[PDB]
Structures are given as structure tokens and as C-alpha cells.
Coordinates of C-alpha atoms in Angstrom, one line a residue:
Chain A
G1299 CA 4.4 -14.4 -3.0
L1300 CA 7.5 -16.5 -2.1
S1301 CA 7.0 -17.4 1.8
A1302 CA 9.8 -16.4 4.7
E1303 CA 10.9 -20.1 4.7
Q1304 CA 10.8 -20.3 0.8
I1305 CA 13.6 -17.3 1.2
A1306 CA 15.6 -18.9 4.1
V1307 CA 16.3 -21.4 1.7
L1308 CA 17.4 -19.5 -1.4
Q1309 CA 19.5 -17.6 1.3
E1310 CA 21.5 -20.6 2.5
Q1311 CA 21.7 -21.7 -1.2
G1312 CA 23.3 -18.6 -2.2
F1313 CA 20.8 -16.8 -4.1
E1314 CA 20.6 -13.1 -3.7
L1315 CA 17.8 -10.5 -5.0
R1316 CA 18.2 -8.5 -8.0
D1317 CA 15.6 -6.8 -10.3
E1318 CA 14.5 -10.2 -11.7
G1319 CA 14.6 -12.5 -8.5
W1320 CA 16.0 -14.4 -6.8
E1321 CA 19.6 -15.2 -8.4
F1322 CA 22.9 -17.7 -8.1
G1323 CA 25.5 -16.8 -10.7
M1324 CA 28.5 -19.4 -10.9
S1325 CA 31.4 -18.9 -13.3
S1326 CA 32.0 -21.2 -16.4
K1327 CA 35.7 -21.9 -14.8
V1328 CA 33.8 -23.4 -11.7
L1329 CA 31.2 -24.9 -13.5
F1330 CA 32.9 -26.6 -16.4
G1331 CA 36.5 -26.3 -16.0
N1332 CA 38.1 -26.6 -19.5
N1333 CA 34.9 -28.3 -20.6
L1334 CA 32.6 -27.1 -23.2
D1335 CA 29.7 -28.2 -22.2
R1336 CA 30.2 -30.9 -20.1
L1337 CA 29.9 -30.0 -16.3
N1338 CA 32.5 -30.7 -13.5
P1339 CA 31.0 -34.0 -12.1
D1340 CA 31.4 -32.1 -8.9
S1341 CA 29.6 -28.9 -9.9
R1342 CA 26.9 -31.4 -11.3
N1343 CA 26.3 -32.7 -7.7
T1344 CA 26.2 -29.4 -6.1
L1345 CA 23.7 -28.3 -8.8
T1346 CA 21.3 -31.1 -8.2
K1347 CA 21.9 -30.5 -4.3
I1348 CA 20.5 -27.0 -5.1
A1349 CA 17.7 -28.3 -7.4
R1350 CA 16.5 -30.4 -4.6
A1351 CA 16.6 -27.7 -1.8
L1352 CA 14.4 -25.6 -3.9
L1353 CA 11.8 -28.3 -5.3
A1354 CA 11.7 -29.4 -0.9
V1355 CA 10.2 -25.6 -0.3
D1356 CA 8.1 -26.1 -3.8
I1357 CA 10.5 -23.7 -5.2
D1358 CA 9.7 -25.4 -8.6
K1359 CA 10.2 -22.8 -11.9
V1360 CA 14.2 -21.5 -13.1
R1361 CA 15.6 -19.6 -15.8
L1362 CA 18.8 -20.4 -16.7
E1363 CA 21.0 -17.6 -18.6
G1364 CA 24.4 -18.0 -20.4
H1365 CA 27.2 -15.6 -20.9
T1366 CA 30.2 -15.2 -22.3
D1367 CA 32.8 -12.7 -22.5
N1368 CA 33.1 -10.5 -25.8
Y1369 CA 36.2 -12.1 -27.3
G1370 CA 35.8 -14.4 -30.2
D1371 CA 32.9 -15.4 -32.6
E1372 CA 29.7 -13.3 -31.2
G1373 CA 27.6 -16.7 -33.1
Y1374 CA 29.6 -19.2 -31.6
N1375 CA 29.5 -17.6 -28.2
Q1376 CA 26.1 -17.6 -28.4
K1377 CA 25.7 -20.8 -29.1
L1378 CA 28.4 -21.7 -26.0
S1379 CA 26.5 -19.8 -23.6
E1380 CA 23.1 -21.5 -24.5
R1381 CA 24.7 -24.7 -24.4
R1382 CA 25.8 -24.3 -21.1
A1383 CA 22.7 -22.9 -19.7
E1384 CA 21.3 -26.3 -21.3
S1385 CA 23.7 -28.4 -19.2
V1386 CA 22.4 -26.9 -16.0
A1387 CA 19.0 -27.1 -17.3
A1388 CA 19.4 -30.8 -17.6
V1389 CA 20.5 -30.9 -14.1
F1390 CA 17.1 -29.4 -13.0
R1391 CA 15.0 -31.5 -14.9
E1392 CA 16.8 -34.9 -13.9
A1393 CA 16.8 -33.6 -10.1
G1394 CA 12.7 -33.6 -10.3
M1395 CA 11.6 -29.7 -11.6
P1396 CA 9.1 -29.9 -14.2
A1397 CA 10.3 -29.2 -18.1
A1398 CA 8.0 -26.7 -18.5
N1399 CA 8.9 -24.2 -15.5
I1400 CA 12.4 -24.4 -17.0
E1401 CA 13.5 -21.9 -19.6
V1402 CA 17.0 -21.7 -21.0
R1403 CA 18.7 -18.4 -22.5
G1404 CA 21.9 -17.8 -24.2
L1405 CA 22.8 -14.3 -24.1
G1406 CA 26.3 -14.3 -25.6
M1407 CA 28.2 -11.0 -25.0
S1408 CA 25.0 -9.2 -24.5
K1409 CA 25.0 -8.9 -20.7
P1410 CA 28.3 -8.2 -19.2
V1411 CA 29.1 -8.0 -15.4
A1412 CA 32.6 -7.3 -15.8
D1413 CA 35.1 -5.6 -17.9
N1414 CA 36.1 -7.0 -21.2
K1415 CA 39.3 -4.9 -21.4
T1416 CA 41.1 -7.1 -19.1
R1417 CA 41.3 -10.8 -19.2
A1418 CA 39.8 -11.1 -15.3
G1419 CA 37.1 -9.3 -16.4
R1420 CA 36.4 -11.5 -19.5
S1421 CA 36.8 -14.4 -17.3
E1422 CA 33.9 -13.1 -15.1
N1423 CA 31.5 -12.4 -18.1
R1424 CA 31.8 -16.6 -18.7
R1425 CA 28.8 -17.8 -16.3
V1426 CA 25.3 -19.4 -15.9
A1427 CA 22.7 -17.6 -14.1
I1428 CA 20.4 -19.5 -12.0
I1429 CA 17.5 -17.1 -11.5
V1430 CA 14.2 -18.2 -9.3
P1431 CA 11.9 -15.3 -11.3
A1432 CA 9.9 -13.0 -8.3
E1433 CA 8.4 -10.0 -8.3
Chain B
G1165 CA 22.2 -8.4 5.6
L1166 CA 18.2 -8.6 6.2
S1167 CA 16.9 -12.0 7.4
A1168 CA 14.2 -13.7 5.5
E1169 CA 11.6 -12.3 7.7
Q1170 CA 12.7 -9.5 7.3
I1171 CA 12.6 -9.3 3.7
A1172 CA 9.3 -10.9 4.0
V1173 CA 7.9 -7.9 5.8
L1174 CA 9.5 -5.3 3.6
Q1175 CA 7.8 -7.2 0.5
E1176 CA 4.4 -7.3 2.6
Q1177 CA 4.9 -3.4 3.4
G1178 CA 5.4 -3.0 -0.4
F1179 CA 8.9 -2.1 -0.5
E1180 CA 11.0 -3.3 -3.6
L1181 CA 14.6 -3.8 -4.0
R1182 CA 16.2 -0.7 -5.9
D1183 CA 19.6 -0.2 -6.0
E1184 CA 20.0 1.8 -3.5
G1185 CA 17.8 -0.9 -1.1
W1186 CA 14.2 -1.7 -0.5
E1187 CA 12.3 1.4 -1.2
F1188 CA 8.7 2.0 -0.7
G1189 CA 7.4 5.4 -2.2
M1190 CA 4.4 7.5 -1.3
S1191 CA 3.0 10.7 -3.3
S1192 CA 3.2 14.2 -1.9
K1193 CA -0.4 14.3 -2.9
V1194 CA -1.3 11.7 -0.5
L1195 CA 1.1 12.8 2.6
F1196 CA 0.2 16.3 2.3
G1197 CA -2.9 17.1 0.8
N1198 CA -2.9 20.8 0.1
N1199 CA -0.5 21.1 3.1
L1200 CA 3.4 22.3 2.9
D1201 CA 5.2 19.9 5.2
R1202 CA 2.3 19.3 7.3
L1203 CA 1.2 15.6 6.9
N1204 CA -2.6 14.8 6.5
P1205 CA -3.8 12.8 9.6
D1206 CA -5.0 9.8 7.7
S1207 CA -1.2 9.7 6.3
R1208 CA -0.2 10.2 9.3
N1209 CA -1.9 7.3 10.5
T1210 CA -0.4 5.3 7.6
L1211 CA 3.0 5.9 8.4
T1212 CA 2.9 4.7 11.8
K1213 CA 1.6 1.4 11.2
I1214 CA 4.4 0.8 8.6
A1215 CA 7.4 1.9 11.1
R1216 CA 5.7 -0.6 13.7
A1217 CA 5.6 -2.9 11.0
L1218 CA 9.4 -2.8 10.9
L1219 CA 10.1 -1.9 14.2
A1220 CA 8.4 -5.5 15.0
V1221 CA 11.6 -7.1 13.0
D1222 CA 14.4 -5.3 14.0
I1223 CA 14.5 -3.0 11.1
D1224 CA 15.0 0.3 13.0
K1225 CA 17.3 2.5 10.3
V1226 CA 15.8 3.9 7.6
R1227 CA 16.3 6.6 4.8
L1228 CA 13.9 9.1 4.0
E1229 CA 14.0 11.1 0.8
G1230 CA 11.8 13.9 -0.5
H1231 CA 11.4 14.8 -4.4
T1232 CA 9.9 17.3 -6.0
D1233 CA 9.0 17.8 -10.1
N1234 CA 10.9 20.2 -12.0
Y1235 CA 8.6 23.3 -11.6
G1236 CA 9.2 26.4 -9.2
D1237 CA 12.4 27.8 -8.1
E1238 CA 15.1 24.9 -7.4
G1239 CA 16.5 26.0 -4.2
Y1240 CA 12.7 26.2 -2.5
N1241 CA 11.8 22.5 -4.0
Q1242 CA 15.1 21.5 -2.3
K1243 CA 13.8 22.7 0.9
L1244 CA 10.0 21.6 0.5
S1245 CA 11.5 18.1 -0.5
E1246 CA 14.2 17.8 3.1
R1247 CA 10.8 19.2 5.1
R1248 CA 8.6 17.0 3.5
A1249 CA 11.0 13.8 4.1
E1250 CA 11.6 15.1 7.8
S1251 CA 8.1 15.0 8.7
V1252 CA 8.2 11.6 8.0
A1253 CA 11.1 11.0 10.0
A1254 CA 9.3 12.7 13.0
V1255 CA 6.6 10.0 12.6
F1256 CA 9.0 7.7 12.4
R1257 CA 10.7 8.9 15.6
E1258 CA 7.5 9.0 17.4
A1259 CA 6.6 5.4 16.4
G1260 CA 9.9 4.5 18.0
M1261 CA 12.5 4.3 16.0
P1262 CA 15.8 5.9 17.4
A1263 CA 16.4 9.3 16.0
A1264 CA 20.1 8.5 15.2
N1265 CA 18.9 5.7 13.0
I1266 CA 17.0 7.8 10.8
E1267 CA 18.8 9.6 7.4
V1268 CA 17.1 12.8 5.9
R1269 CA 17.8 14.1 2.4
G1270 CA 15.4 16.6 0.4
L1271 CA 16.4 16.0 -3.3
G1272 CA 14.5 18.7 -4.7
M1273 CA 13.8 17.5 -8.8
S1274 CA 17.3 16.3 -9.2
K1275 CA 16.4 12.2 -9.0
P1276 CA 12.7 12.0 -10.9
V1277 CA 11.2 8.6 -11.7
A1278 CA 9.6 10.3 -14.5
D1279 CA 8.7 13.0 -17.0
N1280 CA 8.0 15.9 -15.9
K1281 CA 6.1 17.6 -19.3
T1282 CA 2.9 16.2 -18.2
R1283 CA 1.1 16.8 -15.2
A1284 CA 0.5 12.8 -14.6
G1285 CA 4.8 12.6 -14.8
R1286 CA 5.1 15.8 -12.2
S1287 CA 2.9 14.5 -9.6
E1288 CA 4.8 11.0 -9.5
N1289 CA 7.8 12.7 -9.2
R1290 CA 6.3 14.3 -6.0
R1291 CA 7.1 11.9 -3.0
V1292 CA 8.7 10.7 -0.3
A1293 CA 10.6 7.7 -0.3
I1294 CA 11.4 5.6 2.8
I1295 CA 14.6 3.2 1.9
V1296 CA 16.1 0.3 4.0
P1297 CA 19.5 0.3 2.9
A1298 CA 20.7 -3.2 1.9
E1299 CA 23.7 -4.6 -0.2

């Protein structure tokens, strides 16, 4: 049961509603640049800001999901996606979100959002979803 | 898109976000009893309240979609399902939603949410759905 005031904050922070709840997806290019799992300093501050905004209205559970394109080793992409999700998780922990309320998954190339047949598609598949689970 | 106060009312009213938008399904047995497209008075009562709740927060455009199971003449089931969706549009007009803002479709047997092999599945397929369009 999310209040209208909580929904307002999620909307202002850029979340959109999906099957699993309120989701804010950011591409890996925005989040990490040419880094591996170290966030761009700017992206990290941005994420700390989102985290504090949710917590201010007692939104204090998040699920963090990492994705890669299909290009490359499945196993490597899998670990990378997970480490990338964990980088975002750590920002939410330091921002004051309980470790038990934070869930981190690496989904590798399993859950595309765009077509791996094009270089532009693949780029969109490399991403981390911030989800606030709600039914 | 919809506001936080609107989303909250939809959720309260039992609507769920689906791929075509916010959807609230009602079984044809509850709506029509043994009638054809005549609503039974209790269901009329129930529908007026939903309309008013939506109307109270400027949700004044809906799509109403009637469905049947796969039993019987397909041509007849289309017509029955459209007529049933129309009975619901009339309640919504009378509650004050502009006629031009109501979209009626009879989908007959073509959009099942369950399996028609069993009586249980067939009864769930027999429904009218209220849709508030969305992103």
C-alpha cells in the first residue's frame, strides 16, 4: 500500500510503474561510463539523492537488477551485471537503507529490453534497474 | 499521464496496471446474473460508485471491453460481449461521464485470461473490463 504522497515522490524521482512495481532504469553508459563497476562520481551523487528522497517518505526497500547485452561470455556478463547492481546497492546502503531491505540480482543477457541485433540495441540492454517492489 | 492522486484512486478501486493500461475486471455472472445485457440492480449500484470515484479525480475517459468464453456461436458471442460492455457504458454516462469519452468494444472469445477447458476457466473469461488508458 503506497500512499499518494509516496507515489508523488517516486514520480518526481523518475520512476514509472511496471508489473513488479515502480522502476527507474539507468543505462550502464550513464551509470559507469567506460568504468567496470565503479560509478561515475556524478551518477553516484545522483543515486544518493534518489535514495534519500525515497527514504524521506519511508520508501526503504529496493531491488537492484543488472543487465548486459548478449555479446560476449554469458558467465562474464553475468558477474559484471551483478557487480554493477551491487555498486548501486552500496550507494543505497550508505544513504541509509537497511541491508536486509535491499535485494541485488545479476540477470546477464537474460532479460533484454531492445534488440541485440543492433549495436544501439545492445547498448540499451546494458543497464541497471532500480525497482521499488509493489503490487 | 496520471497523477499520484489518480493512481491512488485506481488502486483503491481495485485497478491493476496491465499492458493496455489500468484494468478492473468484473465477472459476467456478477454483472448480469441470468440476464442477457440487462445489469442486475446491485451491479448497477456497484458500477455507479466506481464511475463517481473516477470522476471525482478527473478520470473521465474509459474503455469498456466485454468478453465471453469460447462456447457457442462466435458471431453471437461478439455481439453479446459488445452489448454487455454497452450496458456498462450506460451506467457510466448516467453517472456523468461524457459519451464521447467512453469507448466500447465487444471482444467475444478472442481475448481469454484463462483456459476454456473447464467451467472454472470459462466463467473467468466471461467478464467486462474497465480500462483507463495509460503509458
